[PDB]
Design an enzyme around this catalytic site. Structure first.
Site, mmCIF file in Angstrom:
data_model
loop_
_atom_site.group_PDB
_atom_site.id
_atom_site.type_symbol
_atom_site.label_atom_id
_atom_site.label_comp_id
_atom_site.label_asym_id
_atom_site.label_seq_id
_atom_site.Cartn_x
_atom_site.Cartn_y
_atom_site.Cartn_z
ATOM 1 N N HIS A 190 0.878 -1.095 -0.067
ATOM 2 C CA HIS A 190 0.009 -0.007 -0.013
ATOM 3 C C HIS A 190 1.105 1.190 -0.067
ATOM 4 C CE1 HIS A 190 0.422 0.241 4.577
ATOM 5 N NE2 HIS A 190 0.280 1.391 4.185
ATOM 6 N N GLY A 214 3.469 6.673 8.729
ATOM 7 C CA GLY A 214 4.615 6.917 7.769
ATOM 8 C C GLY A 214 5.685 5.648 8.377
ATOM 9 N N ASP A 237 0.016 -7.577 1.838
ATOM 10 C CA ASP A 237 0.355 -5.924 1.712
ATOM 11 C C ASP A 237 1.957 -5.950 1.808
ATOM 12 O OD1 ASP A 237 0.087 -3.449 1.576
ATOM 13 O OD2 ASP A 237 -0.246 -3.161 3.815
HETATM 14 C C1 LIG Z 1 -5.477 -4.182 9.144
HETATM 15 C C2 LIG Z 1 -6.796 -3.316 9.185
HETATM 16 C C3 LIG Z 1 -7.365 -2.753 10.453
HETATM 17 C C4 LIG Z 1 -8.545 -3.705 10.739
HETATM 18 C C5 LIG Z 1 -7.277 -1.290 10.896
HETATM 19 N N1 LIG Z 1 -8.990 -1.215 11.329
HETATM 20 C C6 LIG Z 1 -9.081 0.071 12.236
HETATM 21 C C7 LIG Z 1 -10.308 0.341 13.002
HETATM 22 O O1 LIG Z 1 -8.095 0.705 12.715
HETATM 23 C C8 LIG Z 1 -7.118 -0.383 9.996
HETATM 24 O O2 LIG Z 1 -7.526 -0.445 9.005
HETATM 25 N N2 LIG Z 1 -6.087 0.712 10.061
HETATM 26 C C9 LIG Z 1 -5.648 1.479 9.118
HETATM 27 C C10 LIG Z 1 -5.552 2.911 9.873
HETATM 28 C C11 LIG Z 1 -4.776 4.041 8.938
HETATM 29 C C12 LIG Z 1 -4.856 5.443 10.050
HETATM 30 C C13 LIG Z 1 -3.112 5.595 10.051
HETATM 31 C C14 LIG Z 1 -2.511 4.289 10.675
HETATM 32 C C15 LIG Z 1 -1.108 4.822 11.032
HETATM 33 C C16 LIG Z 1 0.021 4.057 10.819
HETATM 34 C C17 LIG Z 1 0.055 2.677 10.120
HETATM 35 C C18 LIG Z 1 1.216 1.715 9.717
HETATM 36 C C19 LIG Z 1 0.398 2.114 8.822
HETATM 37 C C20 LIG Z 1 1.013 3.194 7.811
HETATM 38 O O3 LIG Z 1 2.054 4.088 8.473
HETATM 39 N N3 LIG Z 1 0.866 3.526 6.340
HETATM 40 S S1 LIG Z 1 1.839 4.858 5.610
HETATM 41 O O4 LIG Z 1 3.263 4.577 5.931
HETATM 42 O O5 LIG Z 1 1.578 6.074 6.642
HETATM 43 C C21 LIG Z 1 1.384 5.121 3.942
HETATM 44 C C22 LIG Z 1 -0.301 5.072 3.793
HETATM 45 C C23 LIG Z 1 2.520 5.815 3.286
HETATM 46 C C24 LIG Z 1 2.031 4.267 3.021
HETATM 47 N N4 LIG Z 1 -0.500 1.378 7.847
HETATM 48 C C25 LIG Z 1 -1.804 1.813 7.139
HETATM 49 O O6 LIG Z 1 -2.132 2.970 7.209
HETATM 50 C C26 LIG Z 1 -2.721 0.871 6.504
HETATM 51 C C27 LIG Z 1 -2.900 1.024 4.905
HETATM 52 C C28 LIG Z 1 -4.221 0.618 4.915
HETATM 53 O O7 LIG Z 1 -4.144 -0.858 5.507
HETATM 54 C C29 LIG Z 1 -3.973 -1.874 4.351
HETATM 55 N N5 LIG Z 1 -3.803 -1.257 2.954
HETATM 56 C C30 LIG Z 1 -3.621 -2.443 1.980
HETATM 57 C C31 LIG Z 1 -3.628 -1.787 0.544
HETATM 58 C C32 LIG Z 1 -3.233 -2.832 -0.653
HETATM 59 O O8 LIG Z 1 -3.440 -2.495 -2.100
HETATM 60 C C33 LIG Z 1 -3.757 -1.102 -2.282
HETATM 61 C C34 LIG Z 1 -3.286 -4.502 -0.139
HETATM 62 C C35 LIG Z 1 -3.186 -4.701 1.084
HETATM 63 C C36 LIG Z 1 -3.471 -3.711 2.329
HETATM 64 N N6 LIG Z 1 -3.611 -4.083 3.488
HETATM 65 C C37 LIG Z 1 -3.932 -3.377 4.593
HETATM 66 C C38 LIG Z 1 -3.850 -3.706 5.963
HETATM 67 C C39 LIG Z 1 -4.858 1.354 6.165
HETATM 68 N N7 LIG Z 1 -4.036 1.267 7.314
HETATM 69 C C40 LIG Z 1 -4.080 1.407 8.757
HETATM 70 O O9 LIG Z 1 -3.225 1.252 9.504
#
Ligand SMILES: CC[C@H](C)[C@H](NC(C)=O)C(=O)N[C@H]1CCCCC/C=C\[C@@H]2C[C@@]2(C(=O)NS(=O)(=O)C2(C)CC2)NC(=O)[C@@H]2C[C@@H](Oc3nc4cc(OC)ccc4nc3C)CN2C1=O
Ligand SMILES: [Zn+2]
Length: 197
Positions: free
Chosen positions: A75, A155, A99
């Site tokens: 992602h 991030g 992911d």
């Molecule tokens: C497992 C899901 C779980 C049920 C959660 N539910 C609830 C209610 O919380 C829940 O959804 N959390 C979310 C809260 C976000 C708010 C911010 C969270 C802060 C840090 C976090 C570590 C971070 C991160 O830092 N990213 S980043 O570096 O900033 C960035 C965007 C530059 C890259 N990951 C992060 O943001 C992920 C990205 C999304 O997840 C997935 N996308 C994909 C996409 C694909 O093809 C497109 C294939 C597989 C896939 N698989 C995932 C699990 C949303 N994300 C959450 O974490």
């Protein structure tokens, strides 16, 4: 068709230094250099360390070297190439179901060793060089000992979860958010990495 553009490469813009007693982030490339490098795919900067800070034109996150492979999240990187001294480098691993993506580890990087300790006392390394204690709660989940707003974790996907001995246990993937507070995290376990390899 003549109009079609191509996405830039992922670019290393810094690293998390775990060399000594104090973890700290270092930046190795500025914004403009990052954009230039993402378009050409030619990155001549020396690479060091295990945890890299990486950016595209629109996102910034982390990438971690384990077993000679630089791992990060799909992602963040999508199917993008990564910039290298001789041009864009194509991913050698891509698994959207996990992911997870990965390239060959850059020359000069150091790889973490996959953990075989079976310990549940983990440590998450963020892009701000915070070392956050995390208790393992499952194959791919752990709880923060000191919860904090998700803003502090944004991030840091692609960063490592480490065991007490410094082995790689997983790759940070997502945060479980409850009213904006991160009480748990999800990660790609190293065994899932060792399998894909
Ligand atoms: C497992 C899901 C779980 C049920 C959660 N539910 C609830 C209610 O919380 C829940 O959804 N959390 C979310 C809260 C976000 C708010 C911010 C969270 C802060 C840090 C976090 C570590 C971070 C991160 O830092 N990213 S980043 O570096 O900033 C960035 C965007 C530059 C890259 N990951 C992060 O943001 C992920 C990205 C999304 O997840 C997935 N996308 C994909 C996409 C694909 O093809 C497109 C294939 C597989 C896939 N698989 C995932 C699990 C949303 N994300 C959450 O974490
Ligand atoms: Zn270990």
């Amino acid at each position: 068709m003549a109009s079609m553009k191509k996405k830039g490469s992922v670019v290393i813009v810094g690293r998390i230094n775990l060399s000594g007693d104090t973890a700290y982030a270092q930046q190795t490339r500025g914004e403009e250099g990052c954009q230039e490098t993402s378009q050409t795919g030619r990155d001549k900067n020396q690479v060091e360390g295990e945890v890299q800070i990486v950016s595209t034109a629109t996102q910034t996150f982390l990438a971690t070297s384990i077993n000679g492979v630089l791992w990060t999240v799909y992602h963040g990187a999508g199917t993008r190439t990564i910039a290298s001294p001789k041009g864009p480098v194509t991913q050698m691993y891509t698994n959207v179901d996990k992911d997870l993506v990965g390239w060959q580890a850059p020359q000069g990087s150091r790889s973490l060793t996959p953990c075989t300790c079976g310990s549940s006392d983990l440590y998450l390394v963020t892009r701000h060089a915070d070392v956050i204690p995390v208790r393992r709660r499952g194959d791919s989940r752990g709880s923060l000992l000191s919860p904090r707003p998700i803003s502090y974790l944004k991030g840091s996907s692609g960063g490592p979860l480490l065991c007490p001995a410094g082995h790689a246990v997983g790759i940070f993937r997502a945060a479980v958010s409850t009213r904006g507070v991160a009480k748990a995290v999800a990660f790609i376990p190293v065994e899932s990495l060792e399998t894909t390899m």
